[PDB]
Design a protein around this ligand. Structure first.
Ligand SMILES: OC[C@H]1O[C@H](O[C@H]2[C@H](O)[C@@H](O)[C@@H](O[C@H]3[C@H](O)[C@@H](O)[C@@H](O[C@H]4[C@H](O)[C@@H](O)[C@@H](O)O[C@@H]4CO)O[C@@H]3CO)O[C@@H]2CO)[C@H](O)[C@@H](O)[C@@H]1O
Ligand SMILES: OC[C@H]1O[C@H](O[C@H]2[C@H](O)[C@@H](O)[C@@H](O[C@H]3[C@H](O)[C@@H](O)[C@@H](O[C@H]4[C@H](O)[C@@H](O)[C@@H](O)O[C@@H]4CO)O[C@@H]3CO)O[C@@H]2CO)[C@H](O)[C@@H](O)[C@@H]1O
Lengths: 102, 103
């Protein structure tokens, strides 16, 4: 009844203040998104544990600065989800979203 | 012409740059055994090497290695495609894709 997405984010400039995640359901339903904040950190960068109150197989994600001051990769990207859980790694300026730790 | 210059930018998310260097070998138009090249500089993205080879090359191989082959950062051979004897690339720890503009 929920989808949990752990998002790892690394910026080579070390300047994470204000960066947050705009995530929206896409399948099996499309709905307007919400902003999610980073909740922790590890050796790769910031960590967000995102909980969405539906079972989802795909979401959209944009890494954004404050309220749309900038987009780190300014196009919609997607995360494929199995059994209500995914974990991804995202790097500043790199379009590809990784499903294993670099 | 008669030399090839490759500027190689390297970023590690863990900051553990100590010992890392570049193994580069000519591949086209003629293949030869490689050589190690050290980083000489640094910028906001991380380490920088300027690699000069005394031939006009359209393709080189590259491996990012720790000292004398103690480890590789991405273990498979990778290649850089070069036009008119000059190229510049950006390499990220653990990321296979070599980038041709700054992330
Ligand atoms: O089912 C809901 C909708 O879902 C999908 O919409 C996505 C977009 O595709 C994403 O790009 C994003 O939209 C962001 C947008 O990227 C961002 O620039 C900002 O856009 C605002 C803008 O700041 C504002 O000034 C105003 O002019 O409107 C803009 C909207 O374009 O904020 C957007 C979020 O509000 O996320 C949405 C989902 O939230 C889907 O593709 C749509 O078909 C669908 O309606
Ligand atoms: O002359 C053209 C040759 O070019 C190509 O050879 C390449 C390889 O494909 C690359 O992988 C690399 O080789 C490295 C190798 O990756 C690395 O592991 C290391 O291997 C050592 C090892 O540490 C050591 O313990 C012992 O086993 O010796 C090994 C080498 O036999 O070092 C290699 C380089 O010395 O670079 C070369 C070019 O230098 C092409 O594939 C060949 O067919 C071609 O002959």
């Amino acid at each position: 009844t929920e989808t949990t997405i752990v998002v790892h984010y690394h910026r080579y400039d070390g300047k994470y203040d204000g960066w947050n995640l705009w995530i929206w359901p896409v399948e099996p339903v499309s709905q307007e998104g919400k902003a999610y904040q980073f909740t922790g950190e590890d050796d790769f960068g910031k960590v967000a544990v995102v909980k969405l109150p539906m079972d989802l197989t795909k979401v959209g994600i944009i890494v954004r600065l404050n309220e749309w001051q900038a987009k780190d990769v300014a196009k919609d990207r997607f995360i494929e989800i199995k059994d209500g859980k995914a974990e991804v790694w995202i790097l500043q300026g790199v379009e590809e979203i990784f499903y294993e730790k670099p």
